[PDB]
Amino acid sequence: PASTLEGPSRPVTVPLRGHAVDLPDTDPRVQRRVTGWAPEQIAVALSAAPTSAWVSWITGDFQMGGAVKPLDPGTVGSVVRYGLAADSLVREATGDALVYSQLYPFEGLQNYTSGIIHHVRLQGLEPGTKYYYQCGDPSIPGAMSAVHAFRTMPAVGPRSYPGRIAVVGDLGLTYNTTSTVEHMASNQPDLVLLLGDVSYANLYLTNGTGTDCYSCSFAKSTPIHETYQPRWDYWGRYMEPVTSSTPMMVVEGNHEIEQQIGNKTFAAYSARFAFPSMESESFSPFYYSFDAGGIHFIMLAAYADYSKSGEQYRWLEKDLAKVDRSVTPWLVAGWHAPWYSTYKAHYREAECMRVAMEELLYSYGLDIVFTGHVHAYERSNRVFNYTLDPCGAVHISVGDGGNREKMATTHADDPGRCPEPMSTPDAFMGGFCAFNFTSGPAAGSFCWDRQPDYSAYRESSFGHGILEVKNETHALWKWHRNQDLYQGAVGDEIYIVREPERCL
Ligand SMILES: *[C@@H]1O[C@H](CO)[C@@H](O[C@@H]2O[C@H](CO)[C@@H](O)[C@H](O)[C@H]2NC(C)=O)[C@H](O)[C@H]1NC(C)=O
Ligand SMILES: *[C@@H]1O[C@H](CO)[C@@H](O)[C@H](O)[C@H]1NC(C)=O
Ligand SMILES: *[C@@H]1O[C@H](CO)[C@@H](O)[C@H](O)[C@H]1NC(C)=O
Ligand SMILES: *[C@@H]1O[C@H](CO)[C@@H](O)[C@H](O)[C@H]1NC(C)=O
Ligand SMILES: *[C@@H]1O[C@H](CO)[C@@H](O)[C@H](O)[C@H]1NC(C)=O
Ligand SMILES: *[C@@H]1O[C@H](CO)[C@@H](O)[C@H](O)[C@H]1NC(C)=O
Ligand SMILES: [Fe+3]
Ligand SMILES: [Fe+3]
């Protein structure tokens, strides 16, 4: 495959090629397969260091409709027994239980409240080591899970890396999602990054009717942007074969906003997943950091204040200042909204985040950015501030996970498709920062009239990516399209080569 060491490649656009259908609530993989308080939706997450990890799960069925009565989380304990062999779970950790609700005070809308969610942090783990575990409440008969196992990240060091890191976004829960996940699992990743837009529960009215496009269908006829929270539970149940054995790090996208009573947002996202918020001192579910071998990962919030005056930015400055490149040679970031996508969908939508944060990240030698949000695949050439730059990060966007919303197919540079600038900014975060270019081929315009030179590859197909960091300077990136099922199929592949003596 090619290498970034060669400089930028001439842009490639894959010519455009069905329907994407949500899994029904009759699918056996989304049905409740346990009873009483037995654990379901079991998921592992990393802590900030390889020597610790989170185990999470839910006990009890949710409640949808009628007079929901939130469960008392104190009625079911939070216990993980673990050890180095399946028959010797001699260590114990205890954790926290909580519930969340999704409440709408409008006639005809239905309410929701969850089962009891549990989060337990395992401490004192060996890096690179397989741990067996059971979770649940031993004091309740039948309320302990089956034995599962996961492997911690390798120790932090310049020649110590997880073998394969899967990268996906905007999964939703369609049959195309199952293809994405089946492709990914067959590549046996050591770690999964989910770059926002998880269940797409907000494509449903509270009465269970879904659409491919909420604005198109329900915006003018509903008092709020509704959700059907059971889609989250279906998603967690479907994903358990992956999450119970492979650590998954999630960061929020716009579909997690899910505004409800009293302006409350992100309830399901903030409650359902474990994040290394305390350990990375972000103290926020929306952004955080962690090490996986010699890679320092930063997950940033496109949907929390990212301005230079804000708390996330101050945290990010502190987090970057602590990075020691002789210990973690790689610096990799993920967030939901791409900064350099060339599709019409969400074109320049997160520009204010780029203007706020790009220079800081460039000054610290950010190597790679992963995003979702755009329902297509794109890889940029090394770029900084809309300029090809040998020290600029590679920006890769894999928001093509298979949800039921339309694929991004039109490009902003397509004839007649350049959007009106005032229509582009994210309305949730506000501001407008997307001015016409002042230099380069597109100077004086809002869009190019051809594929921008900082776009290396773009293709409107569903899929997932795998990152194989090899050593201090080389990493192999491969993106796999869902419609290819033959052994070894690869849609896009590149060696990302860092040059720290040049750039830092
Ligand atoms: C870091 O990893 C890269 C990729 O595996 C190494 O580059 C390869 O080295 C082998 C043996 O010399 C060659 O056959 C390959 O063609 C190289 N691939 C590329 C893209 O360059 C590199 O040698 C490693 N560097 C160190 C210090 O270990
Ligand atoms: C849903 O919860 C809201 C807020 O508590 C409440 O106003 C409303 O009556 C509830 N709806 C139903 C059908 O109970
Ligand atoms: C989604 O899955 C369906 C059914 O398997 C398939 O026909 C369709 O081509 C897939 N969509 C894309 C964009 O690959
Ligand atoms: C849900 O409510 C919408 C709008 O009132 C309605 O059009 C739709 O048919 C309802 N779905 C069900 C299953 O009742
Ligand atoms: C990015 O490009 C614009 C226009 O050239 C420039 O005004 C701005 O200062 C640049 N931002 C940087 C270098 O951070
Ligand atoms: C910016 O570029 C667009 C075309 O892409 C053009 O229509 C518009 O007038 C320009 N605005 C300014 C202030 O130059
Ligand atoms: Fe999405
Ligand atoms: Fe999105």
- Residues 6+ away with beta carbon under 8 Å from 315: 281, 282, 284, 287
Pocket of ligand 5 (CB under 6 A): 359, 385, 438-439
Q: From the CA of 207, how far away is ligand 4's center (Å)? A: 6
- Residues 6+ away with beta carbon under 8 Å from 488: none
Q: What is the CA radius of gyration of the chain?
A: 22
Identify the DSSP state of 16.
P
Q: Name the residue with tokens 């501001």.
A: 431
What DSSP assignment string belongs to 270-333? Answer: HHHS---TTTTT---SS-EEEEETTEEEEE--TTS--STTSHHHHHHHHHHHH--TTT--EEEE
Query: Annotated catalytic residue: which of 183, 336, 346, 464?
Result: 346
Q: From the CA of 247, how far away is ligand 3's center (Å)? A: 27
Q: What is the resolution of this structure in A?
A: 1.8
Identify the DSSP state of 435.
P
Strands 492-497 and 474-481, sheet pairing: antiparallel
The dihedral region occupied by 230, where left means phi > 0, alpha psi between -120 and 50, and beta the remainder, is alpha
Beta bridge partners of 199: none
- Residues 6+ away with beta carbon under 8 Å from 35: 142
Identify the DSSP state of 360.
H
CB atoms within 10 A of CB 484: 14
Q: Is 346 a catalytic residue?
A: yes
| Cα separation, 230 vs 333, whole angstroms | 31
**Structural domains of the chain, with CATH:** 1-158 (no CATH), 159-504 (3.60.21.10)
| Structure token digits, residue 350 | 């997160």
Q: Please say whether the beta carbons of 372 and 401 come within 8 A.
A: yes
Q: What are phi and psi of 255, to 5 degrees?
A: -75, -5
> Which one of 14, 16, 17, 19 would you pick to mutate in the ligand 3 pocket, going by the greatest count of ligand atoms within 8 A of its CB?
19
In the three-class reduction of DSSP (H, G, I as helix; E, B as strand; rest coil), residue 193 is classed as strand
| Cα separation, 289 vs 296, whole angstroms | 7
Q: Please say whether the beta carbons of 284 and 277 come within 8 A.
A: yes
| Cα separation, 333 vs 313, whole angstroms | 14
| Cα separation, 33 vs 172, whole angstroms | 21
Task: Spell out where 392-435 has E strands.
Answer: 394-398
| Structure token digits, residue 243 | 């999450």
| Structure token digits, residue 409 | 């197919």
- Residues 6+ away with beta carbon under 8 Å from 411: 13, 342, 343, 344, 417, 451, 458
Q: CA distances (Å), 389 to each of 142, 384, 474, 494, in order? A: 59, 6, 18, 17
Q: Give the residue among 81, 50, 61, 243 at the shortest CA–CA distance from 153.
A: 50
Please report, in angstroms and rounded to a whole number, the separation of the first and last CA atoms in the chain. Answer: 26
| Cα separation, 387 vs 441, whole angstroms | 11
Q: Please say whether the beta carbons of 169 and 196 come within 8 A.
A: yes
Q: Please say whether the beta carbons of 336 and 373 come within 8 A.
A: yes
What DSSP assignment string belongs to 136-178? Answer: E-TTSTT-BPPPEEEEPPPPSBTTB--S-EEEE----SBHHHH
Counting atoms of ligand 2 from 1, which one is nearest the CA of 261? 4
CB under 8 Å, gap of 24 or more: what pairs does 314-319 form?
315/281, 315/282, 315/284, 315/287, 316/287, 316/357, 316/360, 317/360, 318/281, 319/280, 319/281, 319/282, 319/289
In the three-class reduction of DSSP (H, G, I as helix; E, B as strand; rest coil), residue 216 is classed as helix
This structure was determined by: X-ray
For ligand 3, whether the C-beta of 460 sits within 6 Å is no
Burial 198-224 (b: 16+ CB within 10 A, else e): bbbbbbbbbeeebebebeeebeeebee
- Residues 6+ away with beta carbon under 8 Å from 457: 11, 12, 14, 377, 378, 379, 492
Q: From the CA of 413, how far away is ligand 8's center (Å)? A: 21
Q: From the CA of 235, how far away is ligand 2's center (Å)? A: 25
Q: Give the residue among 409, 423, 418 at the shortest CA–CA distance from 448.
A: 418
The vertex-64 CA angle with 61 and 65, nearest 5°, equals 145
Cα 190 from chain centre: 15
Q: Give the residue among 403, 399, 329 at the shortest CA–CA distance from 367.
A: 329
Q: Name the residue with tokens 């809308």.
A: 109
Cα 5 from chain centre: 28
| Cα separation, 74 vs 112, whole angstroms | 19
- Residues 6+ away with beta carbon under 8 Å from 447: 347, 412, 413, 417, 418, 419
Cα 475 from chain centre: 20
Q: Please say whether the beta carbons of 56 and 248 come within 8 A.
A: no
Strands 474-481 and 387-388, sheet pairing: unpaired
Strands 53-59 and 39-46, sheet pairing: antiparallel
Strands 165-168 and 330-334, sheet pairing: unpaired
| Cα separation, 109 vs 216, whole angstroms | 20
Strand (E) or helix (H) holding 246 = none
For ligand 4, whether the C-beta of 109 sits within 6 Å is no
What DSSP assignment string belongs to 49-92? Answer: STT-EEEEEEES--EESSS-----GGGS--EEEEESBTTB--EE
Maximum CA pair distance of the chain? 70
Q: Give the residue among 264, 304, 273, 275 at the shortest CA–CA distance from 102.
A: 264
Q: Give the residue among 197, 13, 209 at the shortest CA–CA distance from 108.
A: 209
What DSSP assignment string belongs to 321-375? Answer: HH--TTT--EEEEE-SS-SS--BSTTTTTTHHHHHHHHHHHHHTT--EEEE--SS
CB atoms within 10 A of CB 324: 10
| Cα separation, 331 vs 496, whole angstroms | 12
Let me know how long the chain is.
Answer: 504
Q: Give the residue among 293, 171, 312, 182 at the shortest CA–CA distance from 236.
A: 171
Strand (E) or helix (H) holding 249 = strand 248-250
